[PDB]
Ligand binder design. Structure first.
Ligand SMILES: CN[C@@H]1[C@@H](O)[C@@H](O[C@@H]2[C@@H](O)[C@H](O[C@H]3O[C@H]([C@@H](C)O)[C@@H](O)[C@H](O)[C@H]3N)[C@@H](N)C[C@H]2N)OC[C@]1(C)O
Ligand SMILES: Nc1ncnc2c1ncn2[C@@H]1O[C@H](CSCC[C@H](N)C(=O)O)[C@@H](O)[C@H]1O
Length: 319
């Protein structure tokens, strides 16, 4: 019921989308919403008041692209707008798992925090694996010559293309596919907000794909990573008795064989049935002494107190 709406930026002209985006930049994230911001808040709005704000052609672009639906009397949006780190981003609303369509897109549960964790350097070529709304791709576009976003969710690819268009971004490319299949060549930066959480080894859905999606990602990272390159990964990790996640990750990566350095920053931690541990952390591959290091960095708690404590934290902890 939520996350199956049609998204069609190709049905709308590129300048019109940029103009819509400009209108969203003005009002999205500001309290006391205008009609446009309220539409993008999930509030049914009067289509005439909306027209005052985006014009009649902007009014048509919203309908054609699928950002808005005519309920007859009112307009409503299946999507929700965000403005953060200099981009505007539409995504699905935050709702319970029981009402999520198969193509439900991550509503930015962690994107703002992850962007604050990301190393602030730029470079030549970036890959955003499982790009969802496109949010990480869009931010990376400001400091990378080109960015590729990949997702197996066709709806996420359309949404990603829509968001790029809204921001007038021209150096970002999105491809539908499974993992690294549409990603040719190597990248100096790879970022992955992985679909892993509480499911362990089991595939639940596109947002909880199980540990095997991390095996496949990390096994292939060495032939995809440019020499000197950086990989950043949000993930859940499961330590079982005599079987910690880190030993498996080292194997997948071919740590010594490939000359790789990994640091894991663990933020949340919880005891399990098996006498094991469930962890959520931030994993970084970056040039340095071959090996794996794990530290405790409670960036969730610190995000809640002061979001900008996280800026360059990962740089401080590596340089
Ligand atoms: C791409 N990675 C993400 C990953 O960041 C993580 O996000 C969870 C998220 O699902 C949780 O979100 C959960 O809880 C919210 C709400 C009650 O807060 C629900 O509305 C939502 O349906 C539920 N999945 C949230 N509470 C913590 C994040 N770290 O877990 C899910 C994910 C899709 O794998
Ligand atoms: N085999 C696969 N190949 C590419 N993407 C996949 C995949 N399996 C799951 N995914 C995608 O991984 C994404 C993780 S949700 C993260 C979305 C976005 N990067 C953000 O940070 O908000 C989902 O969009 C899901 O569709």
């Amino acid at each position: 019921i939520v996350g199956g709406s049609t998204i069609q930026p190709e049905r709308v002209d590129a300048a019109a989308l940029r103009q819509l985006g400009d209108a969203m930049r003005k009002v999205v994230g500001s309290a006391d919403p205008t009609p446009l911001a309220d539409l993008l808040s999930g509030t049914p709005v009067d289509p005439d008041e909306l027209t005052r704000e985006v014009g009649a052609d902007g009014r048509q672009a919203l309908l054609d692209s699928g950002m808005a639906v005519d309920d007859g009397t009112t307009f409503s949006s299946p999507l929700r707008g965000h403005q953060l780190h200099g981009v505007v981003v539409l995504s699905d609303p935050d709702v319970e798992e029981e009402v999520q369509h198969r193509w439900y897109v991550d509503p930015l549960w962690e994107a703002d925090l992850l962007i604050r964790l990301m190393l602030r350097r730029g470079g030549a070529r970036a890959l955003d694996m499982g790009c969802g709304s496109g949010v990480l791709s869009l931010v990376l576009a400001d400091r990378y010559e080109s960015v590729l976003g990949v997702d197996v969710n066709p709806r996420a690819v359309a949404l990603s293309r829509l968001n790029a268009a809204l921001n007038g971004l021209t150096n970002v490319t999105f491809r539908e596919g499974d993992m690294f299949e549409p990603a040719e060549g190597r990248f100096s930066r790879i970022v992955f907000n992985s679909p892993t959480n509480e499911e362990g080894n089991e595939f639940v859905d596109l947002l909880e794909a199980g540990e095997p999606i991390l095996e496949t990602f990390f096994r292939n990272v060495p032939r995809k990573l440019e020499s000197g390159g950086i990989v950043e990964v949000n993930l859940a990790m499961n330590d079982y008795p005599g079987d910690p996640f880190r030993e498996r990750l080292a194997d997948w990566l071919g740590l010594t064989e490939n000359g790789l350095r990994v640091q894991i920053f663990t933020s949340q931690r919880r005891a399990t049935e098996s006498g094991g541990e469930w962890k959520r952390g931030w994993l970084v591959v970056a040039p340095g002494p071959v090996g794996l290091t794990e530290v405790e960095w409670p960036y969730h708690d610190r995000y809640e107190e002061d979001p900008d404590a996280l800026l360059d934290g990962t740089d401080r902890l590596l340089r």
